[PDB]
């Protein structure tokens, strides 16, 4: 949970999440797209009738209850591939 640290009174309006693209995604991909999504088979300049911006607003307030309180989430990815291993898990020490 991160509500005091992240959610702010009068509105927290810094986090943006996309909703619509041309096709599906691929895992581990960057798709930062400042291209206004189009629908209705009528390509447009954007932000109008049937012109949708992919990114939306993460409305965050410190009074939101659990279900949509801003959660800080981190995913740790590992690979079990043959290579010179560099990130080894620590050792320990004892008395003499």
């Amino acid at each position: 949970n991160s509500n005091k640290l992240d959610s702010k009174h009068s509105g927290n309006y810094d986090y943006w999440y996309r909703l619509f693209r041309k096709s599906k995604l691929k895992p581990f991909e960057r798709d930062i797209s400042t291209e206004i999504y189009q629908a209705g088979n009528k390509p447009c300049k954007g932000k109008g009738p049937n012109c949708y911006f992919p990114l939306q607003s993460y409305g965050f307030r410190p009074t939101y209850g659990v279900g949509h309180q801003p959660y800080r989430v981190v995913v740790l990815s590992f690979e079990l591939l043959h290579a010179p291993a560099t990130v080894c898990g620590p050792k320990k020490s004892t008395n003499l």
Binding site: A39, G40, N50, Q56, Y64, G65, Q69
Partner: protein
């Protein structure tokens, strides 16, 4: 490519943006409820302006979509909710005229003041009226006050109501409705659902069936009420004719609750009172909400999120700030809900807390649903779900079990008769008045009758169906029944009838699942997690699928019924029918108090 994908994308956009704006508006509303300063008055002004502008713009850009080329039922109903233009279907001058007249109505009703023969006294709907009716037993005071108030309000709003009939008819005609009656009936319209389709007149047939199956019970109760009125005052009421409107117990005949002190059949027996017990235990608002949450956990409904206790206000803010504390709860969302109401050491406060807690649970049940479905399947489900829990908590077995009422007492015959009389006079007295008001409004929108016999026809039907007589006869130059609050702010009354029917049906089916035997009014919904899951099965539905299907998920029937009404009052009706062996049944509409 297809219109369905565009509709889904626009509904996601509308969901998010309307969520943002509605959250802001509802937080501003709670700010109104807590701190009423001019600063937050202006803040709410701009917030509501922005929310209305956003809703209007979204609807206008939604008007480009067609309902014929979309097959998904949820998305179809969402677009149908989007396409309800309302005031914008008509011209700008007419719309601003209508909104100015509604503001005029609000100002007149909020500032309605009537002067006695001595004008030194200043009353205004609140300083008296309610307290006059509920504390004074004088005929002259009630007659004069109600007659003067009705006369002045009619004098100040007759042509406003006429132009309202005209403009609402024109709006309905411009929005593909025959009449504003059909406009109001459009909420219950369901199409595209096999075995679940209901037209605008099917509910009318259901209401007429309820009339046919309800009339004798209400006639007998009217006979008992009038007979008790005879015993209290014998020289002002005829043994067969109907009673004057001003002898129903409240402001306009809606509730017969205040008639308790004169209609109790056995005044010696002690009523079920836990008040002295909660001053024995020194009860508080935090404890009352913890007890409510214990009851709700006992029915598998979820706990109280920390935000509730953290931000919701559970006690009056002293005298530094003033709070309007009518028990209410709006839909903030995103797991944020809260309660504002005055917590006094009373038992009606127990009912109000239970009712609004059921409302909160129903509200949070459909949290995961989209915006246009984040509501009761119809307008009365929320209030019915609120009222069922309070009715269950009003039983004395619950008080015995949860410790408020000590174990060492048993249910007494006359005490339970009085309690059932309370629950009767506090509920079934509102149904006939709801029926009259809603039906009169229905044919007002229909326009079947010219302007020149409205009051005459209305009062004649009142005398003929419920025996409501004018204590002073009035011509077409009066607008007495338009003086109520909800008609005075353009609100439908079918909500209350549906609330009562749904709460009785839900109690019947839930008790049947919970397996309690004997008199049904003594049953309790506690330690019945199977029944709790059964209730949640309809709670989570919202507006995704028809309210008739939602009802089928509880009772198993697709239509409203009078069977819960008949069954809940079987022993009361038996006792009234065995006591009615030597009393008149029925009324005569010819008798009026000024015809001698």
């Amino acid at each position: 490519s297809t219109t369905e994908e565009q509709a889904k994308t626009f509904l996601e956009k509308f969901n998010h943006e309307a969520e943002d704006l509605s959250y802001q508006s509802s937080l501003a509303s709670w700010n109104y409820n807590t701190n009423i300063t001019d600063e937050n008055v202006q803040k709410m002004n701009e917030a509501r302006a922005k929310w209305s502008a956003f809703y209007e713009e979204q609807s206008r850009m939604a008007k480009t979509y067609s309902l014929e080329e979309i097959q998904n039922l949820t998305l179809k109903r969402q677009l149908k909710a989007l396409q309800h233009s309302g005031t914008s279907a008509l011209s700008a001058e007419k719309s601003k005229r209508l909104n100015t007249i509604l503001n005029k109505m609000s100002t007149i009703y909020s500032t309605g003041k009537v002067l006695d023969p001595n004008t030194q006294e200043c009353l205004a709907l609140e300083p008296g009226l309610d307290d006059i009716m509920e504390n004074s037993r004088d005929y002259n005071r009630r007659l004069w006050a109600w007659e003067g108030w009705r006369a002045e309000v009619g004098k100040q709003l007759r042509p406003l109501y006429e132009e309202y009939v005209v403009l609402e008819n024109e709006m309905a005609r411009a929005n593909n409705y025959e009449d504003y009656g059909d406009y109001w009936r459009g909420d219950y319209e369901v199409t595209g659902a096999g075995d679940y389709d209901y037209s605008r007149d099917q509910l009318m047939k259901d209401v007429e069936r309820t009339f046919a199956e309800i009339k004798p019970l209400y006639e007998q109760l009217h006979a008992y009420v009038r007979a008790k009125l005879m015993h209290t005052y014998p020289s002002y009421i005829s043994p067969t004719g109907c009673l004057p409107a001003h002898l129903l117990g409240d402001m306009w005949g809606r509730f017969w609750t205040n008639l308790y002190s004169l209609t109790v059949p056995f005044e010696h027996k002690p009523s079920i009172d836990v008040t002295e017990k909660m001053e024995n235990q020194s009860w508080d608002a935090e404890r009352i909400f913890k007890e409510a949450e214990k009851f709700f956990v006992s029915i598998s409904l979820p706990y109280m999120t920390q935000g509730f206790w953290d931000n919701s206000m559970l006690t009056e803010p002293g005298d530094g700030r003033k709070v309007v504390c009518h028990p209410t709860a709006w839909d903030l969302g995103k797991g944020d809900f809260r309660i504002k109401m005055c917590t006094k050491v009373t038992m009606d406060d127990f009912l109000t807390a239970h009712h609004e807690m059921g409302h909160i649970q129903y509200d949070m049940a459909y949290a995961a649903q989209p915006y246009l479905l984040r509501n009761g399947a119809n307008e009365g489900f929320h209030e019915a779900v609120g009222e069922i829990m309070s009715l269950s908590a009003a039983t004395p077995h619950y008080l015995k079990a949860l410790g408020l009422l000590a174990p060492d007492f048993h249910e007494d015959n006359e005490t339970e008769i009085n309690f059932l009389l309370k629950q009767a006079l506090t509920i079934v007295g509102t149904l006939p008045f709801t029926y009259m008001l809603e039906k009169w409004r229905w044919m007002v929108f229909k326009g079947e009758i010219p302007k020149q016999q409205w009051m005459e026809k209305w009062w004649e039907m009142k005398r003929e169906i419920v025996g409501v007589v004018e204590p002073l006869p009035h011509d077409e130059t009066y607008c007495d029944p338009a003086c109520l609050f909800h008609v005075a702010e353009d609100y439908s009354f079918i909500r209350y009838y549906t609330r009562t029917i749904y709460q009785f049906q839900f109690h019947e089916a839930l008790c049947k699942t919970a397996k309690h035997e004997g008199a049904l009014f003594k049953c309790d919904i506690s330690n019945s997690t199977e029944a709790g899951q059964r209730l949640l099965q309809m709670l989570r539905l919202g507006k995704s699928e028809p309210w008739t299907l939602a009802l089928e998920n509880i009772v198993g029937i697709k239509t409203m019924d009078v069977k819960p009404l008949l069954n809940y009052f079987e022993p009361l009706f038996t006792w009234l029918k065995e006591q009615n062996r030597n009393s008149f049944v029925g009324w005569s509409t010819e008798w009026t108090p000024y015809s001698d």
